[PDB]
Nucleic acid binder design. Structure first.
Ligand SMILES: [K+]
Ligand SMILES: [K+]
Ligand SMILES: [K+]
Ligand SMILES: [K+]
Ligand SMILES: [K+]
Ligand SMILES: [K+]
Ligand SMILES: [Mg+2]
Ligand SMILES: [Mg+2]
Ligand SMILES: [Mg+2]
Ligand SMILES: [Mg+2]
Ligand SMILES: [Mg+2]
Ligand SMILES: [Mg+2]
Ligand SMILES: [Mg+2]
Ligand SMILES: [Mg+2]
Ligand SMILES: [Mg+2]
Ligand SMILES: [Mg+2]
Ligand SMILES: [Mg+2]
Ligand SMILES: [Mg+2]
Ligand SMILES: [Mg+2]
Ligand SMILES: [Mg+2]
Ligand SMILES: [Mg+2]
Ligand SMILES: [Mg+2]
Ligand SMILES: [Mg+2]
Ligand SMILES: [Mg+2]
Ligand SMILES: [Mg+2]
Ligand SMILES: [Mg+2]
Ligand SMILES: [Mg+2]
Ligand SMILES: [Mg+2]
Ligand SMILES: [Mg+2]
Ligand SMILES: [Mg+2]
Ligand SMILES: [Mg+2]
Ligand SMILES: [Mg+2]
Ligand SMILES: [Mg+2]
Ligand SMILES: [Mg+2]
Ligand SMILES: [Mg+2]
Lengths: 177, 48, 163, 46, 48, 44
RNA sequence: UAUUCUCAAACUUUAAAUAGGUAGGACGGCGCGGCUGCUUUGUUGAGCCGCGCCACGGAAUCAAGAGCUCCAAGUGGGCCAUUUUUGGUAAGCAGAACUGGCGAUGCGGGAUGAACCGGAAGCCGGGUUACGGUGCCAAACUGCGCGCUAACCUAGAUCCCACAAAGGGUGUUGGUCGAUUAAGACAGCAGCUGCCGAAUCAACUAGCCCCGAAAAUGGAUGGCGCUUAAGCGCGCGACCUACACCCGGCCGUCGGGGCAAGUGCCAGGCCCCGAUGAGUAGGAGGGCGCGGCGGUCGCUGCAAAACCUUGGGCGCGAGCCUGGGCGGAGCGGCCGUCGGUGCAGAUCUUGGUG
């Protein structure tokens, strides 16, 4: 329904000129929180990869890409480049989610946690839906089990809403797995 | 447009209902400054 | 005076351009200067007479007098909260005719005829120029799309030509 | 010893004041030979 | 008359975008002619 | 409330669906990643 | 002779960004004539003059307007910060460049602070925010989510900011490259080899943690405390919070408008409309108060002045009016005018008193 990160196809080109009346048309698949930020990052890469700045470029089309089957579970592989405190590195990550938007959200959260990498220090190189038999990370493999079975070792005790919250109770919580 | 627009006194808007994100950063960075294109309308609702 | 000579700090400003020394081409001496013309002051390092102070180098002024070998030039000079009209005489070797008003005369004639052509047909128009405005909508024919993606990092390429 | 701090601010309080420009400018300092003839030309103008 | 014009422009833009899609091309929307600007910072410590 | 029950020709509707479907395929199309010869194995 | 490593404030072919100058009409243009002692071989030029004609204002945006003059105060010790930058090992050191800030300025945040962040202010009601926050202190979640960390060193806990390094860890968590493995690896066991029946080995990289890490009154993430964090990184929703913004009331200031054959007015007035409010040094305006003088209007032994009061009221305020008391003989308002005319300070003067 609502995602932190949205996937967009951005299409643009250099402004037509007398030497090139039909300049090459470039497309990118970019992740951003909305259309405005997707366009800005599109010109960032075109400026540094194709030497086409926004001042001498033309925005053609921008469309948001939605997950095809948002009700099933897919394995998503993400190839990314990120900047640490001392240089640049490449890494491959895998995630399980119903939509690639969720998998990308997990990637940003994980990078912030395990590496203290902020959002603007990450470039997504490639994304793909990996079949179960081609996954590489064990964090994803262990859930490829037809007889998946485990208990809830840690539960969160709380009333359904704060309406039923009281400071004092006559007895302690009764918990059992 | 020049005469019609100049005829209008600058609009005295109120502080946004719901607040701002970060006035010190550009809207692209998650802040509030700069061009936000069609999203200015969302802000106009909360400030008018 | 008072700690700085007339030509102090003119090592670069008053030096001739590379491989452009020696004889001065005579088109400089065939220029015609009239009262009211605009001229750009560019000091020639070879001519030591009638040369302006370094401040007036690179400034545009208006001609207010003509002599045998020099032209009187009016140059604005900001002193504290005022602009002063400095009148200086400069030998013609140090002045170039400026093209700052080259479009004015030709623009007036075009405006005059456009208004005249519009007056006869009773259609009030405006000859004012306008800055670049927004472009209209249009369709671009589809073509092959080249996909651009971020490049994987390689340390060996962090140097002109690589390591 | 010296500093230009605040001096531009002072100059802009009432400046920058451009000098008043009149249609006719002073002829002092112009070529006397040209000026003298111009005076005679106006004298006999009719 | 103005109300009719506004609706026609909105539907005209939709038709053109669909027309370009059918032919396999792109329709570049006309650049915005009007901006609304809001000041978000105070009047303290202003560069000239 | 009354459950009361087209503005495009049947042939036109088929063409519209095909064009939109083709456009969506280009939207999700990925690069071949052939220019990155040093990272062919890593990129898969 | 052809190449090659590495360089320059006082070297340079080349060469930015930022900044600097000029121009974008009515002081324009064209046509026909005229003046000259200047100029030309030359009514050829140059400038000027007269007449006639044309000139939709000749980029954008703004313009709480533009110009001019007089007289004069204060000041002429500065300091701080981003960035550029000189001397110096360095300095809360010294000296410059552009801008802002403090000084002259409160207010919210940073526990605390002239300069940091937010933001500048008449007196109020309501609403909403900025920065910063929502375990208690303390207004707002022990809110909804993921991961990381375990500190037997006082784990850690937010710009300026109140510190920590090289170098290390078989602590733990991610990632990168390579090697080995169901044809049987690795450990142990067995005599290169058999049992063994599932993963294993090596290097690099960077998060948190730990070592490296020593000071004198007892003490400081602000304190208490916190480990299904109340720590660290990244999110979501709601909420709290300025003298900032919005609406309303009232005060002042500034600007604008209305009011005469006047049923007509402290016109120095009344009424209506819009904007706006920081201030040391300094300037000015309108007012308050004291004592005389020229006038005018009054009060007082049926109680003046002064003084006293937990009496009351008016004015933003200087002050004013009044009740009661004391006192026992003078006093006040208003217009003008005048001056030895207003005290918290001066190791102020005299007197008195702790
Ligand atoms: K020197
Ligand atoms: K002085
Ligand atoms: K480690
Ligand atoms: K009297
Ligand atoms: K009394
Ligand atoms: K008096
Ligand atoms: Mg306002
Ligand atoms: Mg609210
Ligand atoms: Mg905020
Ligand atoms: Mg700032
Ligand atoms: Mg001297
Ligand atoms: Mg000097
Ligand atoms: Mg000489
Ligand atoms: Mg600030
Ligand atoms: Mg002094
Ligand atoms: Mg001094
Ligand atoms: Mg000093
Ligand atoms: Mg002082
Ligand atoms: Mg502090
Ligand atoms: Mg309030
Ligand atoms: Mg909690
Ligand atoms: Mg280290
Ligand atoms: Mg604290
Ligand atoms: Mg108000
Ligand atoms: Mg004031
Ligand atoms: Mg008196
Ligand atoms: Mg008392
Ligand atoms: Mg009195
Ligand atoms: Mg006296
Ligand atoms: Mg006295
Ligand atoms: Mg005293
Ligand atoms: Mg005093
Ligand atoms: Mg004393
Ligand atoms: Mg004494
Ligand atoms: Mg005593």
């Amino acid at each position: 329904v609502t995602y932190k990160f949205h996937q967009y196809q951005v299409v643009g080109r250099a402004l037509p000129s007398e030497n090139d009346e039909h300049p090459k048309i470039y497309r990118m698949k970019l992740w951003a929180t909305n259309e405005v930020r997707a366009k800005s990052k599109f010109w960032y890469f075109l400026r540094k990869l194709k030497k086409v700045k926004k001042s001498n470029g033309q925005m053609l089309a921008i469309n948001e890409i939605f997950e095809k089957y948002p009700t099933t579970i897919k394995n998503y592989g993400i190839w990314l480049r990120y900047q640490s405190r001392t240089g640049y590195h490449n890494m491959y990550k895998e995630y399980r989610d119903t939509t690639l938007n969720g998998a990308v959200e997990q990637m940003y959260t994980e990078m912030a946690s395990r590496h203290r990498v902020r959002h603007h220090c990450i470039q997504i190189i490639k994304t793909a839906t990996i079949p179960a038999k081609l996954c590489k990370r064990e964090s994803t493999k262990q859930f490829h089990d037809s007889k998946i079975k485990f208990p809830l070792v840690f539960k969160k005790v709380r009333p359904p809403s704060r309406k039923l919250k009281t400071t004092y109770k006559a007895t302690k919580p009764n918990l059992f797995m | 447009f020049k005469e019609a627009n100049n005829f209008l006194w600058p609009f005295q808007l109120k502080a946004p209902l719901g607040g701002l994100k970060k006035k010190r950063n550009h809207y692209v960075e998650g802040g509030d400054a700069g061009n936000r294109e069609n999203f200015i309308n969302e802000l106009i609702r909360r400030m008018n | 005076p008072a700690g700085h000579g007339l030509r102090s700090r003119t090592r670069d400003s008053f030096s001739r351009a590379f491989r452009k020394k020696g004889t001065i081409a005579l088109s400089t001496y065939l220029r015609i200067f009239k009262i009211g013309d605009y001229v750009d002051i560019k000091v020639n390092g070879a001519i030591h007479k009638g040369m302006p102070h370094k401040f007036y180098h690179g400034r545009t002024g208006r001609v207010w007098n003509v002599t045998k070998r020099a032209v009187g030039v009016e140059v604005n000079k900001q002193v504290r909260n005022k602009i002063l009209r400095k009148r200086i005489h400069v030998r013609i070797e140090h002045v170039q005719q400026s093209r700052c008003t080259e479009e004015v005369r030709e623009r007036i004639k075009k405006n005059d005829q456009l208004k005249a052509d519009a007056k006869a047909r009773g259609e009030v128009i405006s000859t004012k120029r306008q800055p670049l405005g927004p472009k209209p909508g249009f369709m671009v024919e589809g073509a092959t799309l080249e996909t651009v993606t971020p490049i994987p990092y390689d340390v060996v390429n962090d140097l002109k030509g690589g390591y | 010893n010296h500093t230009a701090h605040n001096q531009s601010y002072k100059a802009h309080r009432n400046g920058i004041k451009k000098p008043k420009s009149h249609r006719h400018s002073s002829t002092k300092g112009m070529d006397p030979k040209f000026l003298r003839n111009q005076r005679y030309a106006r004298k006999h103008n009719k | 008359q103005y109300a009719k014009e506004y609706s026609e422009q909105e539907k005209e833009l939709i038709r053109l975008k669909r027309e370009a899609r059918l032919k396999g091309g792109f329709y570049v929307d006309p650049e915005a002619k009007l901006l609304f600007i809001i000041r978000i910072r105070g009047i303290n410590a202003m560069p000239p | 409330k009354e459950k009361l029950d087209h503005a495009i020709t049947k042939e036109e509707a088929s063409a519209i669906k095909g064009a939109s479907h083709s456009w969506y395929k280009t939207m999700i199309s990925d690069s071949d990643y052939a220019e990155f010869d040093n990272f062919t194995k890593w990129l898969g």
